[PDB]
Amino acid sequence: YRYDGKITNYLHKTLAHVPEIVERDGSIGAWASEGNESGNKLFRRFRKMNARQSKTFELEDILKHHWLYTSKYLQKFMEAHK
DNA sequence: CACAGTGGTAGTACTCCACTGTCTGGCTGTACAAAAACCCTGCAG
Numbered sequence: 001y002r003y004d005g006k007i008t009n010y011l012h013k014t015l016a017h018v019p020e021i022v023e024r025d026g027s028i029g030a031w032a033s034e035g036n037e038s039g040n041k042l043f044r045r046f047r048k049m050n051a052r053q054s055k056t057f058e059l060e061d062i063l064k065h066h067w068l069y070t071s072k073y074l075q076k077f078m079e080a081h082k
Numbered sequence: 083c084a085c086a087g088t089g090g091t092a093g094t095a096c097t098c099c100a101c102t103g104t105c106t107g108g109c110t111g112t113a114c115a116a117a118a119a120c121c122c123t124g125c126a127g
Contacts, residue, residue: 053088061089
């Protein structure tokens with residue numbers, strides 16, 4: 001009664017093309033939007049804490065500081081080797 | 083006549099790298115005293 005002529009995009013996508021793409025990419029969910037998205041949280045705080053702050057320079061120093069946040073070289077240090 | 087921020091800059095200001103001698107302040111052995119703070123005992127109510 002609820003699926004006669006209508007199906008949500010995802011229910012179809014998840015019931016149809018999943019085995020195929022898992023066969024092809026080798027895996028999925030590692031490729032998820034999550035690794036992006038989450039980052040958005042930072043973009044908010046880096047727009048307050050670390051912002052300049054004026055419209056001109058703001059994107060510049062957010063972007064820079066973000067890049068610095070992402071780098072491995074630093075995280076290596078912050079592990080403190082156990 | 084909020085307030086506590088917000089990063090880059092250019093400003094200023096201070097404080098550092100070699101060459102040297104010279105200075106005062108400070109330590110080590112025991113000897114030499116004068117203060118330091120009791121508690122004695124001594125002499126007195």
